């Protein structure tokens with residue numbers, strides 16, 4: 001089919017959390033502005049998805065629904081074909097979303113007072129999942145060298161020596177810095193984890209969005225023993241812009257860990273009964289592979305436009321290329337504005353809506369995260385508006 | 395439009411928890427057998443809903459979605475028009491399901507050791523919400539006379555005196571006895587609650603399926619002060635057969651109680667982002683009223699066919715008419731079979747799949763719950779099959 005990645009769309013007054021946030025922040029925002037914040041695409045969904053769901057509505061009843069064996073096989077085939085990862089269909093545990101699955105993980109495998117290690121700066125909900133449940137947030141700050149982030153293995157090893165720490169909440173690819181971890185880096189983290197009593201919770205929700213030139217590696221696929229104590233969070237929501245269909249595939253090899261995760265899930269959120277949620281995942285995996293490839297190309301072209309934009313108009317600001325996700329990390333520190341004032345500047349002067357770096361942790365202070373999943377023309381419009389705003393700032 | 399309540403459908407191999415459960419229990423079930431357990435309908439979804447959903451799919455983007463103002467107004471209108479209940483839009487808190495919402499009520503407003511009063515026999519998850527979270531189940535057993543259920547007010551008031559009991563978890567209409575509470579009964583319960591420090595958790599998810607001859611009263615609409623400490627669980631799921639669209643509307647008047655519920659919901663399941671869930675509820679509410687009325691007539695017609703069937707065929711078994719829901723409570727006590735062996739009989743001999751009464755509490759042992767939401771033809775087929783099994787049992 002013909003794929004549209006050029007049509008500027010409008011989600012105004014449609015229930016989009018992203019757009020509604022924008023208007024709430026700047027009621028006077030211009031009608032031509034597009035928000036570049038929340039992680040969902042400003043592209044229509046795969047045509048095959050839409051046709052498939054419509055066709056499905058005429059063949060099924062919208063009552064209590066669970067995953068069929070075909071659905072499970074389909075999920076399993078996607079992991080082999082796309083990630084050289086062999087999973088068992090009975091390793092699949094469904095939740096309405098990854099975040100709830102992470103909260104459920106904290107709740108079941110740790111208690112109040114226990115420590116949970118997160119590598120910061122990172123997707124803020126990681127923090128909430130931990131602190132909002134009386135658990136201790138143990139930060140292993142990423143090392144930032146000239147804009148490239150790497151893991152402080154020394155600190156990580158030290159942290160794993162504290163018995164009060166019960167798990168490593170890992171993000172791969174890493175939102176917001178866009179790091180796609182190398183096998184070497186993963187192997188090092190592995191020895192440390194295998195030497196400690198830490199469980200591995202690996203949020204790999206962005207694993208299908210890898211920029212040309214790089215390759216994602218499912219963390220638990222590199223070692224049997226590691227897998228034995230790893231919970232990998234995955235979904236097709238980010239990959240195919242369906243965070244609104246409410247379906248996730250939590251991969252858990254260890255039968256005990258898996259049953260414990262389930263019993264904890266059933267006493268909190270329960271099993272997802274969504275009928276179209278399962279179906280949307282199955283269709284995307286079976287029929288939307290080409291759409292994803294086209295989408296990745298556009299995303300790659302966008303990160304390069306953003307990078308060239310700053311090199312041409314405001315060199316002291318840097319927007320380096322990323323390895324994964326469609327969220328680019330932009331260093332605005334040379335602008336010398338305190339994050340609150342910068343945010344103010346961005347929202348009301350440039351009417352450009354990023355995900356202010358500071359919300360991912362203090363290490364994100366001075367940075368901005370731009371959502372690259374939009375037509376290249378929308379990105380150019382936004383940047384040109386920022387160009388005028390930064391020039392006026394002088 | 396034309397409404398179909400006559401086509402015998404099949405939910406085999408489509409992920410239905412009901413049908414799949416049937417083959418799980420009796421792998422040798424007939425291919426002509428329709429299960430009558432789980433509370434979802436064996437009727438095709440309202441046409442308006444289907445056409446609406448397909449149309450919306452060509453228009454929207456399936457990303458992070460929340461409720462629109464139009465969405466809220468619609469829920470408020472349904473509450474006024476259908477239940478003479480005056481509610482404000484900000485009283486509306488959404489959750490994926492009513493059970494998770496109930497689990498959330500226990501979790502936030504009580505603590506391990508505390509007691510929660512439930513009027514048994516009743517929907518099994520109620521017991522789970524409590525005991526699975528280290529809370530105590532305080533049973534206020536129903537009074538049963540000739541098959542008519544009433545509240546043991548004497549025991550209720552007594553229980554409301556034990557300050558260790560934090561709240562009454564009310565089911566109205568009451569699954570599985572079909573009771574639709576009378577204004578005067580609610581009045582008595584209201585007084586016990588207002589005279590004590592009990593919170594009121596009224597699950598009224600079945601309040602739209604009222605049988606010809608009765609009127610349901612929204613518990614918190616009878617007294618302002620009761621509403622001040624009441625959480626009402628509502629949903630369009632049972633009404634329009636969309637338990638698979640996952641969208642609940644928990645109504646909470648008091649701002650503080652509401653905020654606690656929300657923060658609690660966000661520490662477990664989180665906000666529902668399911669875009670279609672919001673749209674389905676809106677459409678059914680705005681367009682499927684005629685469908686609902688037609689649907690209740692068939693259900694009422696079926697309950698009477700069941701009641702007559704036993705009178706004419708096996709008088710010692712009683713299936714008295716119900717006032718609400720489409721789940722009829724049948725008394726097989728005269729059969730002198732212990733629930734376990736009786737269940738075995740139904741499943742394998744009559745191949746009729748009920749919701750064995752004993753799962754709703756000891757007071758259910760000897761009873762069977764039949765799902766009347768199916769074409770009258772399928773109900774007849776089901777009865778005739780049992781008819782033979784009973785005669786064979788002699």
Ligand SMILES: Cc1ncc(COP(=O)(O)O)c(C/N=C(\C=C/OCCN)C(=O)O)c1O
Pocket residue numbers: 064411412431432433434490491492493494517565569597599629631637642749
């Ligand atoms: C009083 C009551 N509350 C809540 C619910 C469920 O609400 P939800 O969580 O879907 O929003 C039901 C239906 N419960 C049944 C349905 C099945 O539950 C198991 C589904 N696989 C039944 O057979 O009685 C009910 O009778």
Ligand SMILES: Cc1ncc(COP(=O)(O)O)c(C/N=C(\C=C\OCCN)C(=O)O)c1O
Pocket residue numbers: 017018037038039040096097098099100123171175203205235237243248355458
């Ligand atoms: C590492 C990571 N995990 C999980 C999720 C969300 O998973 P869910 O619970 O939907 O399955 C995201 C996207 N998080 C973003 C957006 C979410 O907004 C949610 C509220 N609208 C973002 O802008 O980085 C993410 O980056």
